[PDB]
Amino acid sequence: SKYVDRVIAEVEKKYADEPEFVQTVEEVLSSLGPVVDAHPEYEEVALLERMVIPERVIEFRVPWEDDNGKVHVNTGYRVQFNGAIGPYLGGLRFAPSVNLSIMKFLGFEQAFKDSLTTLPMGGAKGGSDFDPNGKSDREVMRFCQAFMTELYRHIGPDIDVPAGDLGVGAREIGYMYGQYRKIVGGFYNGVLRPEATGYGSVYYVEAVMKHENDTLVGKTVALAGFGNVAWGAAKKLAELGAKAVTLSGPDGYIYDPEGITTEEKINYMLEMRASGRNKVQDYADKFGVQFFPGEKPWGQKVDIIMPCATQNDVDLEQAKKIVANNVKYYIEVANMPTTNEALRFLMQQPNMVVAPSKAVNAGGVLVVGFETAEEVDSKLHQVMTDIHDGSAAAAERYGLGYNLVAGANIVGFQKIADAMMAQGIAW
Amino acid sequence: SKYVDRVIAEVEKKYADEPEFVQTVEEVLSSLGPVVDAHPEYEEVALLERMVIPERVIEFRVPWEDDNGKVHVNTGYRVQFNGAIGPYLGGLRFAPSVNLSIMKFLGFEQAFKDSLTTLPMGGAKGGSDFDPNGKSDREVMRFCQAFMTELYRHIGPDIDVPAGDLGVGAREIGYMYGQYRKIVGGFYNGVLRPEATGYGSVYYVEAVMKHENDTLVGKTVALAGFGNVAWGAAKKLAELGAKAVTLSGPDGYIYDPEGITTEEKINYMLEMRASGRNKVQDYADKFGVQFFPGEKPWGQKVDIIMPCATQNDVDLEQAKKIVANNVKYYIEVANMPTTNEALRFLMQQPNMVVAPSKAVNAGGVLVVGFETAEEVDSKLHQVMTDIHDGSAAAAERYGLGYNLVAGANIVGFQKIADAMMAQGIAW
Amino acid sequence: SKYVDRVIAEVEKKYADEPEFVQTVEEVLSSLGPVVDAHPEYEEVALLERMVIPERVIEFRVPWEDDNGKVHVNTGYRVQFNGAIGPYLGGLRFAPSVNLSIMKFLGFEQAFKDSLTTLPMGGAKGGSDFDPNGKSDREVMRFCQAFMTELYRHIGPDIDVPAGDLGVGAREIGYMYGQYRKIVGGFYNGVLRPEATGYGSVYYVEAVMKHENDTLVGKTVALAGFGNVAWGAAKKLAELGAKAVTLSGPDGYIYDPEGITTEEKINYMLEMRASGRNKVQDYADKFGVQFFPGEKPWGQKVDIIMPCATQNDVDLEQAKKIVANNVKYYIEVANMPTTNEALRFLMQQPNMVVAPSKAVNAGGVLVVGFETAEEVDSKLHQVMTDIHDGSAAAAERYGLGYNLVAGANIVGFQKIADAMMAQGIAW
Amino acid sequence: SKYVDRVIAEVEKKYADEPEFVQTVEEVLSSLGPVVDAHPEYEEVALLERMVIPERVIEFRVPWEDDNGKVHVNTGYRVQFNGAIGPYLGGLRFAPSVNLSIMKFLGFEQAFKDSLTTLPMGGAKGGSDFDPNGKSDREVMRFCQAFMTELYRHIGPDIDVPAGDLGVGAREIGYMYGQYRKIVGGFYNGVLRPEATGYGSVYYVEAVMKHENDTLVGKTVALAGFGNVAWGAAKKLAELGAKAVTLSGPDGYIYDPEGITTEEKINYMLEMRASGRNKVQDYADKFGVQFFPGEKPWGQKVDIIMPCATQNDVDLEQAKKIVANNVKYYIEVANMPTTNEALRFLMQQPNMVVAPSKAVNAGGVLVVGFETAEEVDSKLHQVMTDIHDGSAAAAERYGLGYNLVAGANIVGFQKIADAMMAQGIAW
């Protein structure tokens, strides 16, 4: 679409300095042509142009004191991107790499993901360039308290609901909540455990298998990372028939053919993550396997690719070693783990099925929105499916075949456009 | 525990002038040793020391006019003791004996009781030294309105929820609610009927019977008082097999061996309470029985003791006439109806089972938190049980045998400590 | 007055456990007979009965962490006693001796003092049993922050204005203000330097001298304590003709006949107070004078008594050594530095003039309400006078002669009664 | 200072993408060494590190409809940088070049300028990349209304006060105020006329003249631009003895030796600015003078340089044509009209006097804070002077000679550090 292509171009220019954000926009909008074309009324109200600008952005100074009485100051963020369908919802990420571009891309992704759950929740994202690593508990508490001393005013039950994410575990949330309860004095219930993510991902794969008249039973899966997201996958994979043979880190990745399918193998994933060493080989040391120093696991022969580590983890080169291994299933679980070039390439590859992280990892937020153990697994499992089927049906309707990527975008977007169109020119 | 023993000592000193409150603290904490010992991290964050101080206390002047245009001024209270697990919840008591020590002890008890229901509700208590007795309805209205003209600002749906209690019946609540609706203009639904209390108490006794391989069928029960709490007990007891033979007042108590088990006998309990005469013998006059002028019913031979009147209703002497009648079941239903000395003594007595009011009378708040007739009786019945079983399991785990007193304390406390520990140093 | 005498009696009973408060009430009300007698309409609306109950009381838990990561928990208070004439105004006191009785007595005094300034400000008082002594600056900051994290909600520009007092210096105020600015985000200007107090006191003495056709020139003055209040007095006294010869501490007091009238002698008062040693003799060591170990300076021969240390510093015995030295001028500067028995005695002594702390030390709040250097000294000086003259005129009108004590009470009270009478039965 | 040099370096890195902001920081901090060195306690509390991060930043989507029903969407900003001394205060700039870096640099400058006025006002800045040029009045109204529909919540009387600036004239302010009054329903008085700026600038020059034992009488002044800022200067200059000979635009600049000193010459400045043509030569056409196409007026021989147009209007090359004309007076009036290299160079030039825009143009905000005609000119004139003298005295104290640049920085900074130090670690 010319409207679509323009806006993209405009964003590229305007936010050249926020690459992650630009990347995300291209990808999503690029998939939107067909729809925009059938909705000429969108351009009339500059819909795309409004969508790409967060409704509201908050950056704030977060000064705090360490255990030695030394003062540190970090930056806090809260990006309330789109609330067309409901109160903003999104996690907080505490990592030294966090900035506006990153919060913006996540926030943007979050509104689409939130749109797909069928739950009426908008998208937001927050965080800080603060690094919980190396910090005392007391120090996290103090930081969290400082962080919430400002944030509290921008959020609230039917306004903005924060949740957990990278750097923000139950502990951080507990510390922030206490500060919130102390200030506002209201204290609702939980200002917002990843096996849901991991599980939902696998539950999605099933729907894929089935659509493909296929089976998970006896499949080799390559994971990236060894964090909560891989672990929850490996677990479910192992329990469902398949088995993981790869985990990667910043020091390379390891190959395990027996599969990471044993109560003990997996529990090590917990040990390594809680060991703050951030080194995959510790595993190579543990279970006496082969570890490949400073390498990416995408040259391994596998039935399925399931990247659960970091962004742009898969560029073009890596995608060439993949299609060159005739892997039929590339499944994003971590946010943008593939360069937009890489992906297109794959989307381009005819025998393979590609799934988008925004759909695939919508497991966590689902549950969250859900506030027993199996009234759960049940719904997560089920909704994960409807999400798969919905995306599939949509791509088709628009004559794209089995494009799970576009489909996801079209479905989530469709829910938003309608809302914004009904609500008029205000936001 | 030395930590435990210290704090107790500190409280004793500090609040020497608030005896009821001191009493309650000793009792609860005294039961907490074993746990504290396994949680050395508690002392590190002065947990006990924070717990014994209400988060926030409010006293206020309540000036009002009587039917003769004469002005009276009373004191209002709202003790928001602990909100670790959820919005404060607690009733209001209107009695001329009310003061801070009393609101404090109730508020403190209330957070433990509230903790045991499994409901996420904190503990609070409010009231006034105002005496509804002798007052016109109009006069209660006016007082209630004056009372709420201040309170409204400290409470609210997800902040603090008041309920009914001694002196505060549906009428008072209705009058306060109207004032609230008129001021805030919000008007939620019910700023907060004791047969639940009475019923739950009996439902607890059952769980006890069962644990004891025993039966309620054909048991003699001694009640104290003839208020809503005794009545609801007698009713259920009578309906369940047992029968009441005692009711007490400020003028003594009466003995009825036929049992207070007839539609008519019981309904008199309603008549006497609504007659404002506050004299048990009116009953002795009614059903031609023996009334004992200026005596406490604890010298009677009975299967069960169920004190439903006032606090420290059972000291040491009384406990000596009891163990000396080999009563196996002493069941507190009214708040602290036993001196801490008395109780210990009993707890000390090997054949008897002792139940704590905080667990036993958790019937009312349960229901409240519940906002048909039997979806109710059902849950109340059930939860009452889980409460019994939980307390039992806990005492055991800690090697105390069947100590329903400690068990209650340990369970309620355990839910609170965790919360406070998760929320950090703020409150 | 029978109304007056009753209420007093009622208060005595009711608040037996808050002695300081009882004391203050007796004193003030005891002076009010004549007025009450001419205002029978007061009793009709239970005026006295409302007055003795603070409009609103707030106690709160203040948990904080020390430099060693150890957690401490103290109690915060804010007594908003009377706001008939304007927003509450009052300081905060941080001392380990602080409790409700004390905040209550100060709060009560504060509304009378505030009434006398002609400024439209009500009376309040706050504080904590927290002891800044021995604490690091960081530790005060942290405590102050915790303290304000709760207080902020009860105060505000045209609601309640806190100021400084014992334990609360510019530093504490600065720390609290920053926390306030950070939370509410409003940040007005100064949530509230004692030479004003000290100065005003001396300025009052002048009006007294003049009324007495007397002179300050060449007078011996006995001070108690060596804090900001004595210092500011000594300074002005020294500059005005007189000279201080006594300072007292917890270890006794010292006699200096040359007078504490030298740039250097006085500056030591600053040194001793900033030395946290709390020992008057350090002065005895410094300027080689006589110090009397464990004694009260009231046996010294002096023209004027000016107690600037602590409460009930002067009981009956001490008053007997005083009248027995024929001192014509007893001037309270510190709050209730005399037992009610002592004072009456003195009030009883025919040649002497007695001034009440509430009038005498109204110097500080005046200035405060004032938000150059001499537009100041000017007004303080002047108003101090009008206060003296007003009290004098009032006592007379009521046929009490030159009773500066009663007069103060009558004037301050008169301003309040009128207001409360105009505003009706609400507070 | 090593602390100073570090932070600068850190900022350079971190905000490489916000050049204007980096520039401003270097300049200001670079002047701060001496002070920081005498205040080692600053580093202890990471003062510089907190200062460079705005307390709070707000970006927002501003969708609006044009006269043709076409929808446009712009970005709104409000940077509440520092409120140490008082409520934020700052204008709004509506220009298509506006972004975060720019709002940030202005906001940062604004807190120093605001600090120098002696008024207790913090610094903020807001705006939008919206371009009032070419827009209908109705269209500005609609945009302003949309803009305020979000902003209203972040501002308020004693919170944040917006004022006028580039793109925001009385009309915009009026339109925003009406929207504010309509929403909040409060409607204070003026959510915030440049001859004050212009005048104050000249009033500052006088203080400079005097310090230099010099006279404005018969001086040639080179202005840049022909906007409100030049006009107000020319006017006062013309009235005070001097005369303008240059005005510049985007198309070059013109030379007028008769001087722009006639009621009519000047009034044309109004005509050209209101003609939206943005072409200086229109003037060259009008008064038949020489206009230099695509040139900067800094090669002209003049007594004084007074840049009133745009930022970095004077780089190094331009500064070389200036010192090479031995101009003794370089006076910044527009914000950063000189590259940091240029300036240093000049600061480096021994015979010349350099004045900083932050001091020089503090005329407007002064007045603003002032809410007749000459109670005004009076104070503006006077304060402008004290500002000059203060900066001078400061530079000296620190042994810098007559460095009006550093001096300004030191004075404004000094007021802020103290405040932040008193308020503790919160912001």
UniProtKB/Swiss-Prot annotation, chains A, B, C, D:
Record-stated family: Belongs to the Glu/Leu/Phe/Val dehydrogenases family.
Annotated site (Important for catalysis):
165
Taxonomically, the superkingdom here is Bacteria
Q: Which InterPro entries match?
A: Aminoacid_DH-like_N_sf (IPR046346), Glu/Leu/Phe/Val/Trp_DH (IPR006095), Glu/Leu/Phe/Val/Trp_DH_C (IPR006096), Glu/Leu/Phe/Val/Trp_DH_dimer (IPR006097), Glu/Leu/Phe/Val_DH_AS (IPR033524), Glu_DH (IPR014362), Glu_Leu_Phe_Val_DH (IPR050724), NAD(P)-bd_dom_sf (IPR036291)
Q: Name one GO biological process term.
A: glutamate catabolic process via 2-hydroxyglutarate
Residues crossing the lipid bilayer are: none
EC code:
1.4.1.2
Instruction: Tell me which GO cellular component terms the UniProt record holds.
Output: cytosol
Active-site residues from the entry:
125 (proton donor)
Endpoints of the signal sequence: none
Binding positions (substrate): 89, 110, 113, 164, 368
Query: What is the designated name of this protein?
Result: NAD-specific glutamate dehydrogenase
- The primary gene name is gdh
- Reaction it catalyzes: L-glutamate + NAD(+) + H2O = 2-oxoglutarate + NH4(+) + NADH + H(+)
Its Gene Ontology molecular function terms?
Answer: glutamate dehydrogenase (NAD+) activity; glutamate dehydrogenase (NADP+) activity
Q: Which organism is it from?
A: Clostridium symbiosum (Bacteroides symbiosus)
Q: Enzyme class, one word?
A: oxidoreductase
Q: How does it assemble?
A: Homohexamer.
Q: State the PANTHER family in the record.
A: NADP-SPECIFIC GLUTAMATE DEHYDROGENASE 1-RELATED (PTHR43571:SF1)
Q: Which residues bind NAD(+)?
A: 197, 228
**SUPFAM superfamilies, per this entry?**
Aminoacid dehydrogenase-like, N-terminal domain, NAD(P)-binding Rossmann-fold domains
Provide the alphabetized UniProt keywords: NAD, Oxidoreductase
Its pathway, per UniProt, is: Amino-acid degradation; L-glutamate degradation via hydroxyglutarate pathway; crotonoyl-CoA from L-glutamate: step 1/5
Keyword Oxidoreductase in the entry? The reply is: yes
CDD domains assigned to the protein according to its UniProt record, in alphabetical order: NAD_bind_2_Glu_DH
